[PDB]
Amino acid sequence: GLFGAIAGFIEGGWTGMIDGWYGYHHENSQGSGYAADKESTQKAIDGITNKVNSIIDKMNTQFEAVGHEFSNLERRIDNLNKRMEDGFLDVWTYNAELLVLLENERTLDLHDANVKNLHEKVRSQLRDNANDLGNGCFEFWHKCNNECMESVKNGTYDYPKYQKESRLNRQ
Amino acid sequence: GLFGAIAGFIEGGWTGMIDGWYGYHHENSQGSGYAADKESTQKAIDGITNKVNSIIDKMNTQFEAVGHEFSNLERRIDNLNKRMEDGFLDVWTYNAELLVLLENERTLDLHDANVKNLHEKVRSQLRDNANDLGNGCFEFWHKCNNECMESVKNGTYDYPKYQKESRLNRQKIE
Amino acid sequence: GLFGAIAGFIEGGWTGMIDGWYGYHHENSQGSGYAADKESTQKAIDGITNKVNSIIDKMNTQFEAVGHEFSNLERRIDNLNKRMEDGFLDVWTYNAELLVLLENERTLDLHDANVKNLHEKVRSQLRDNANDLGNGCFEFWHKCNNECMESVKNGTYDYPKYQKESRLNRQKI
Amino acid sequence: DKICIGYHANNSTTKVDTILEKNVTVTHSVELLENQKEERFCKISNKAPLDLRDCTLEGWILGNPRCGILLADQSWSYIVERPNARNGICYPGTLNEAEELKALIGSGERVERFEMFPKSTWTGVNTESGVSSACPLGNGPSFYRNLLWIIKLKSSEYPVIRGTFNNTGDKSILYFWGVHHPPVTTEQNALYGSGDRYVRMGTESMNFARSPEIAARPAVNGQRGRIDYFWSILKPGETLNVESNGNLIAPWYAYRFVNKDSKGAIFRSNLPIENCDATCQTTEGVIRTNKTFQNVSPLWIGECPKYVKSKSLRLATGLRNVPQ
């Protein structure tokens, strides 16, 4: 099912992020910029590459019709051959066309889940040191330099280090 | 596959909500009532209709058996024809029966996800201005009239507007 | 899609939990230990058994090739029969192999969602009476004895009961 | 003040099956399989089917004298044959390539009956008296209406007889002939004569020759002799030359044949044909539905749903029904 992230609480995508499917946009005193999430993008590519190859690999056989001919007294086996060939044609057409519909849904949902998990991975880290705007963005209750931003992407954000400073910003 | 909402943390359904699959129930000084979320419901309806139609569209061919006859000296091609016709029958029965099982799971899980997402949409808006009861309900820390209720449903809830009154009703309590 | 729990924010599994797929690990004054959540585990077993049985049941027919023979003047219907037998063989080989791939994915995702849902069910109960470490664990803001642990596992945790003690350990620090 | 998020519920007791759980109640669902039928035959494309009544398909097309009701122009959407029709091949013998003939006719939509070789074609022989008690018309003996049984005169010998038909029309012609095989040599000399006898048919694309095969046989329909029946298609522009010196069962009446531009059908059924219309006609009855699958029959002629073995194929469209 939909995971609510893509075209959801994150309303749109970024044409500014060109080095990955999923990622971050940061802002601080040292500037701003886009940066793709290195972990999840590669893993998604590996999975989808595997899915496409696996699908191709399972479709890697062929029903081969022949051009054999039949006399006017072989109408039955002629038609028998035709209904067989048309029969397998309709089966494989069914298989291919339906597989595309179902799996395209899965592929798009897979990205959706990847975006949600990435957002949750961040939200889990920052806790109350940051303000969840609900749209995929987090405003920090402390100064977060490039290295601080970098730690969030790394998934090694130091919560109790900035804990005092964040809480000590109650107006 | 389950998203935990339907028959989950939202323990039961509402027979009082008759105009949609997913929706809200509110309570304030002006009373209570059910209201279906038309946006998320309609989107699901379009999707499920589409799913059903696509399935029908792909099943829109037929293997057609014939009533051809065979002599007592044509036993082999007679049997050949029989094994073929029975063969495609077993293939299509398999395809049809298994597809119903697999996609029914997906459809039911889809609704579960939709209810979950709608719930998260509300929770994201209200933030700490409301109290998450964990059962799909939110107790407001402020007065929320019909116009306020509508904004939660509208997705246009004004959080900082009620921030002070809300936070000024959590310390009064406790 | 991945639900983020298994091999996710909960980095690893427990070889110490041998009586179930999903469950808890607690620590308190009376010691520590593993305990499988029997409800959600049993429910998963019921579903997976049903899934496997349903798949087998739909595969419960067979295309049967025969050993009929053909003369040298029957090359065409010989080849017809061979292409048919090979044809149904390729269809069922495809169906089985592809179904296994797709459903194995679903099965693994199913376990992931069950673990995620179980984690949220607990998180909903403890609320701010416990501290969410982000790794599937919860540090309690109060003393939680064996009976208290059982109530969390049972899903009958009394929140307002421990609320004051909890807040009086958030205010102490 | 509070707001809650929830989902629909109703009084539905309709259940669907899932991969993880069976017998699951849902709020909304659709049945995809149709299992109801009207046990009768109706018209396809506003054209009535041909009822063969008390005649088999061979009995009809060979012109069995008891099948007189069917011996005329016919246009059918499909054919209905009754299981135990008494009137088939009345005079004992084998119809050559019988199944291919039935397959041909099944792919047909209309036949036009006409006289191919009139009795006057064959001179020096007895074109009358070619009847049998095994093929009765009324009470008296008779013979097929599309075949002519020729026996020799006692006054003269049985000469080499010849016939010619030029197919100058645009429709193919389905015609029949035969070779008579007397049980004993005496009868052969009496009906046709001594020496080597032959029946020879030929067109631009067909070459046919048979001889009498005298053999002692059990009596069938009171007759120990046999007739080998044959059929063929005279293409437009083609010409048929008949040449024989004995044992010839000559083509008399034949059919102008019209090929159906789609799949045709021949149903073996006891069901009544009625004054009704149908889009889908199976051998087990009429199906009126918008559903995608049917449980009725794999044999059908109109536009029908796909045939499967399933008792039910119900898709969930709605939600898991959880009333409080």
Added chain:
Amino acid sequence: DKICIGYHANNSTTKVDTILEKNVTVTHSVELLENQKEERFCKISNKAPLDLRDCTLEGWILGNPRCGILLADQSWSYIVERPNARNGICYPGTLNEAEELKALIGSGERVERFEMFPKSTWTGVNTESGVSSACPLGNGPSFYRNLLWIIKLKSSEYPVIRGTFNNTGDKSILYFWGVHHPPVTTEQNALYGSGDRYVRMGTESMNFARSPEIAARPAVNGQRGRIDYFWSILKPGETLNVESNGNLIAPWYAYRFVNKDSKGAIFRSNLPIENCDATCQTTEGVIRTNKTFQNVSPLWIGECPKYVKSKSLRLATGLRNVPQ
């Protein structure tokens, strides 16, 4: 004080494949495909198979003199034919509709050998001395045990012989006969005589009459002559009339036929038959499993799993195994 939510892990190293990732270790799984076989033949339904040994299937049913070991009633669960059997159609010639014959017998369950036409049926003739070096038993000449080679007496002419069999039993009868074609006029006149000769078989549904086609053919087993072999089914209630004045290879012993109520099989294999039981018997061997698929063979008798090309079909039942 703390509580953690987690998931099972164990010492499993069994892997499955998913659409997104291959070689995925899981805690629990089930294999659906079977690749193990016992390379031998066992009994199906407490009934032993028929081993044709050093005889082909035609050699058995025609009664090739070296197939004495099989010369009896036969009841089989299935038939095992050996690849390089020496004993088949010993006297050169073609068996008409051979492949349909094998298909018919393969669909069979039991045959009862009986004497259809005893030698006394044919009078005025030599029922002995109908042997050939082409069908040797030991060193001396012999012939098929189900066929009678009738030649004229030296002293006399070959009279018209006649035979009749009414099948009043409930089982269909499988019988064989032949027409001998001597290589030169000398043998024809010596064995049967000059003038026109004939072989006549006839039932209610079958009409057979042939003459000898004398011709010099390449030598097979020292024979320039040929025998045209035929087989047929005498339906219950039917009657066979045999009539000939020469060149008849007469039916001697025939079979009462029992239709198998299910699929039958004829395996062409070198595997040994042993005293064992099987539910699933393939041409490559026995399969004992509860798995749903097998990797062994598409040709089998009994209850077998579905045949696929896969090396493995393992469903994950448990979860991704992440030990610590």
Added chain:
Amino acid sequence: DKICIGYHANNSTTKVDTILEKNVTVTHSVELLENQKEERFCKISNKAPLDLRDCTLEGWILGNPRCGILLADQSWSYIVERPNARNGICYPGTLNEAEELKALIGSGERVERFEMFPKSTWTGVNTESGVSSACPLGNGPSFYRNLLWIIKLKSSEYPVIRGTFNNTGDKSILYFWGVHHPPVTTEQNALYGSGDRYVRMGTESMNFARSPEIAARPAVNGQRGRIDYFWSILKPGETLNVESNGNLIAPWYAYRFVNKDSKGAIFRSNLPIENCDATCQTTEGVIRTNKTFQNVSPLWIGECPKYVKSKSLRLATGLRNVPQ
């Protein structure tokens, strides 16, 4: 100070279909179906196909005098026959088991033409002057180059003629013969003679005998007569005996036959054959692709993608495209 989590978007306008929604724009996708072809024939495995040109396949293999360019050794990866080749069966008649013959040759890889029975084989007869206006070469009458039309000497009778071929090679031999059927008794007596005439062919495993069937037929290519053509395979080590006293269309040249170790093909097409390479060759043309499906043709030789009816099969690899 802030950080946002988001996803890729671009100017992609490529759409895919899903089960829930159609025409869905995505960031990345891959097309699996190929619809492009080079309307021509190329080489498979660097081996050129056989162009039959203005000859039908029967005309080529029988040696129609106008097919001289093809009358030689031939090696093909597959065969191309043209729809309206003028040069086929020039002398009117039916080739027996024609379809099985084309099927056999299609499974062939190479033929080597050689002289089986030279004209000197047949003694007492006229091996010259066996030509026809129905089979012209240039202006004058002629005949097939693989067949010899034998008529009697004018001075003498038509004797029993014989021929023998020991196939001592390792390759099977494809050979042809025929039986001539004059329209009237006069021509029969003039070309071969009165009384019973016969054509007899025999090998260790094959037995053939026919007689003339004199009958008046419609004129085809100026001929009221017919020839029944026959073909067969002389197995390695086997021997063929020809024996006839009239009406024999004798085997003259034959082919050493080489079986293809895989499926071969015979395409009926007007497409040009060129000196080019292909991995996938369909009857509609060459397909050069890495894609998994094609909608081009079900008939092909070599390695081709799977044939389906689809116009498009595009898998999404990327994400739903949602630019700011």
